[PDB]
Design a protein around this ligand. Sequence first.
Ligand SMILES: [Zn+2]
Ligand SMILES: [Zn+2]
Ligand SMILES: [Zn+2]
Ligand SMILES: [Zn+2]
Ligand SMILES: [Zn+2]
Ligand SMILES: [Zn+2]
Ligand SMILES: [Zn+2]
Ligand SMILES: [Zn+2]
Ligand SMILES: [Zn+2]
Ligand SMILES: [Zn+2]
Ligand SMILES: [Zn+2]
Ligand SMILES: [Zn+2]
Ligand SMILES: [Zn+2]
Ligand SMILES: [Zn+2]
Ligand SMILES: [Zn+2]
Ligand SMILES: [Zn+2]
Lengths: 301, 302, 303, 303
Amino acid sequence: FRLTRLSNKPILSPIKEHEWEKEAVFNAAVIYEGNKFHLFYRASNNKFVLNTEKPEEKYKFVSSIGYAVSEDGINFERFDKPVLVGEIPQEAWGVEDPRITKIDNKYYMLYTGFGGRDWLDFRICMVWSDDLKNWKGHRIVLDEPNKDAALLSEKINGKYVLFHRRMPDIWIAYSDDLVNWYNHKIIMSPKSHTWESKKIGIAGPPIKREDGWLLIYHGVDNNNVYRLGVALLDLKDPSKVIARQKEPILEPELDWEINGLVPNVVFSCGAVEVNDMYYVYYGAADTHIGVAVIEKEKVKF
Amino acid sequence: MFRLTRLSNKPILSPIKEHEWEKEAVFNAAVIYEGNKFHLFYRASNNKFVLNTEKPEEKYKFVSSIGYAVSEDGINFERFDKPVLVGEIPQEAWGVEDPRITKIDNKYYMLYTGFGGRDWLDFRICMVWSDDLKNWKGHRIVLDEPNKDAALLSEKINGKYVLFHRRMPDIWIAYSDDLVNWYNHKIIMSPKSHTWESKKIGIAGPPIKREDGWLLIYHGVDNNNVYRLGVALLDLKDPSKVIARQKEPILEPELDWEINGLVPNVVFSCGAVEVNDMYYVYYGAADTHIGVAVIEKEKVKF
Amino acid sequence: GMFRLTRLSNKPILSPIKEHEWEKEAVFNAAVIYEGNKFHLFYRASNNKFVLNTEKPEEKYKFVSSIGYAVSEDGINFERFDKPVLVGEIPQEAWGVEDPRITKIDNKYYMLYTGFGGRDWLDFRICMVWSDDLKNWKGHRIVLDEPNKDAALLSEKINGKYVLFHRRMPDIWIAYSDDLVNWYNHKIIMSPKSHTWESKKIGIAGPPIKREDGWLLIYHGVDNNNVYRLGVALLDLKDPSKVIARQKEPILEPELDWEINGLVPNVVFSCGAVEVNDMYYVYYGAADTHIGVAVIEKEKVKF
Amino acid sequence: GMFRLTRLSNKPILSPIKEHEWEKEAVFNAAVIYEGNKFHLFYRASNNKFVLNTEKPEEKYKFVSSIGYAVSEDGINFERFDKPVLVGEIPQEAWGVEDPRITKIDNKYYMLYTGFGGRDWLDFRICMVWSDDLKNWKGHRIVLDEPNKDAALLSEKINGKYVLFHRRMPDIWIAYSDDLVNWYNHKIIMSPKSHTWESKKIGIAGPPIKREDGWLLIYHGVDNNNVYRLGVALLDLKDPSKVIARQKEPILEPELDWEINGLVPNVVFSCGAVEVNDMYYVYYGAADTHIGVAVIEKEKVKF
Ligand SMILES: [Zn+2]
Ligand SMILES: [Zn+2]
Ligand SMILES: [Zn+2]
Ligand SMILES: [Zn+2]
Ligand SMILES: [Zn+2]
Ligand SMILES: [Zn+2]
Ligand SMILES: [Zn+2]
Ligand SMILES: [Zn+2]
Ligand SMILES: [Zn+2]
Ligand SMILES: [Zn+2]
Ligand SMILES: [Zn+2]
Ligand SMILES: [Zn+2]
Ligand SMILES: [Zn+2]
Ligand SMILES: [Zn+2]
Ligand SMILES: [Zn+2]
Ligand SMILES: [Zn+2]
């Protein structure tokens, strides 16, 4: 099965007037709480030079997190300043690719913090809220180069569940206290000589179903195209993949998906279940934001 | 198992000391054979090349210009008093370098390295175009990133313009609908460790079409930074797949003005054309002079 | 036109034994010799998990590798023993003896392994012992006194010269000796391949297996993400310094959970393979934790 | 018509002395001057083996080159001393002073050597000392402020200019000076030849020797497997920048066991050669471990 885009034009785009989202808005975390779609999007003040040996001050780019409430989920409302920015020098180049999970009655935002001192100088980072507004308690989740981090919305046997991507696999780990992680296991690997050969990473947090946890994920071919796949995690044991779909659910097809700051990228940091429907919010070409949907009942393996 | 043969063991173009532009080096030239004439567009430098400072320093500034030269025989060229292309301040303040010219339909495209001199990564691929080889227009940054060794394929593939470029250290391909926005970036060729082409490789001139594929002359740099040329063959209908790559170089520094010069141990081509079932390969030597070497088309087998 | 190894079991054939300190966490990277119609397995064994991310090897995370012995008729089911057959000498091998490769040359058996001192992450070298019975190892010497590993002896001399395969980072090396003590004629014989599974480094697997068309050179290849797979090349029979064929695609990759997950993830690694009844039996460590075995019919080996 | 050197002895003429820490492991790559009917030999000496295969020079494998003095009447039997005559200054030459080549220039003696700081593998440069008497050295300076080695001085000015041979990789370079501090008009003199015994790199051996027919340029060449062999070229007597002759094949190459096996296998390397009784004496390091001497009659030198 495939996702279907709602709009064949970006539902959000950069705002050249605001320096902080000047060149890019993409990779957005999203929650459905106030019967509205609460979208937290990566935003860049510059284009992305990636081919240098080390990140260069000449080509510095700063990621930021912007908010965007919407009632129907297609037309959004935005604000003049970011809702999250780097405040310690390990986020010098900013805060990237947030994933938001709410556990008990707190909202947790996992994102990558990038220091620009080298291309490994990035950390999984977490802040938390109780309202989605006042983000306190900054911590580095793992003291290691790692990203594509989400939290499972439930605890499993009283342990918090973190998904991450030690290169190039999707990993699970477990916490007593959201501080120390142990029992790191690989859960899913890239498949060679396919669209998902180079690496894979979780998209948005897994979405609970009756039959398992929905693992929307991205896959990178060895020409660095980002597409989206789908897999199912055992509900009792999210460390086991009980199914996974061969072909992708979303790949670059529109021109603002193929062409843009980093071409041939579709990338989701956030999905939501709304009206028997899944709403998948994907950065396109690391420049704009799109949204695509599936009818819950058409999800089958 | 072939190599080029030099038509002369002396430069065919050399710097002109009376001209400030082109006072110290003429090298890395684009080539078009149009209407019985060899149309040469040569990188030209007003100054020696000091590259061992931490940043480009004004006291060591060099300016690359593009000169033009024309010939009937490929050997004796008419030259002109002034360069046909120079750099726009600020992004091209230290000049415009290593042009590669591709005709597509009835237009001509000059991809070159604009260099701003504000740091050693202050360069990019740029493109200007003309329909006449005389009036260049429409400068655009091809990729807004530190990249070079770029050239356009002489025709489209599946309705798409084909860019070759060199994100360090490989030869990349890429595709465009509009000659502005590029996608489908793919690595196509890589250095080989423990060879003359171990440190890096880049495309030479644009690929020359054949019946058996695209002729991909390229340069390879060894661990000692020696520039040599070698050849590959790209698949005719998909130029991103290599189908043959010769092991040994086709041209390497051999003559004193290829080994010694402003940058020692360099032969470097930005251009080769087909004339009379021969391939003419023009090359800078030591980043200081231009020579030309040939190979009979019949001798190009892998 | 590529060939793969096929696993004999989807479960490991040797796993750690928790009553034995010297093997209570890992058994892997094993040499193998087939003699007296028995598979003789000399496996690496760790008393601890492997913390490798520290600036120096820390006593608080010390691991000790020993070499245990297992024997089998069918190459699948093994008899094991209480005590290891090789341990490290102190202090040069205080962190033990790793990745043994056993070569028989003229009714003497040569075990090459990495002695690891633990004093820093470069405190390792190629070591050798020998025996005439596979039981009483003697003659310890440092083959090459440098940080080096993935070493194996060729099963016969070439022009009167002993032949050593080693691995100065990141290529497979070769060298020659008149006396099994002093090595000369060093030469790179094979190199990693950029933008492939074997791009970071390569290293010999088990000692090469003689064929009519050359020497079978199973090797391991390390990708950018540190995944260890197995590949295969063919060496020239009379001049094993020359690679005359090399399969592009691996012959074995981490696939099963005890190969992908373990003390070191994403690892398949062979220190030994033997030929029995026109089949190649390749024993391999798996996630530096267990031992599996894959086979190939030799008629399927085609380059 | 190829010509080659003839070893005077199947024995080294200088060996390490294990009781002297500074020359414990290696004496090699020696300069030599013939003065006072004496062979004056200034030899590089190492306190340690040579671990060369690490990505970076590591203080745990540090080796220190000093330069020792030895004298002989007969050219074979040398008298030696307790302590070195020159050592590396900390920190610019922290890993010592290598490969001296001594040129006499109007009753002065100039010793050019490679100083090596061991902070990275390009942490080396050409340094120069001089003396009045081959005894009281002074005047130390960094000849070129760049990674460079294999340096010698011509024994007289050319057009009133001091002449320097150096080796910007991989070629032999020449350079000119007025003051022996500033060098200019650098240009490539000679280059390796791919797919021969001298394909990887070349470098000068001893300072050129004056002949009526030009300047004898013994040089070393390195093949794809880092074997070091001595070659011979001839430079125009009035313009030593022009190579007027070059023998295709080596004049010396590792043959004896203490030239094949050693701290650095497969190396003969000469930093000095003198003419005595119409005969060239070529002192050479062997395996970076010992010093030998090979000769060739003057009249046999022919291109
Ligand atoms: Zn505004
Ligand atoms: Zn942070
Ligand atoms: Zn990812
Ligand atoms: Zn004029
Ligand atoms: Zn420009
Ligand atoms: Zn590459
Ligand atoms: Zn290039
Ligand atoms: Zn070659
Ligand atoms: Zn027991
Ligand atoms: Zn040992
Ligand atoms: Zn290598
Ligand atoms: Zn290895
Ligand atoms: Zn593959
Ligand atoms: Zn003494
Ligand atoms: Zn010095
Ligand atoms: Zn040298």
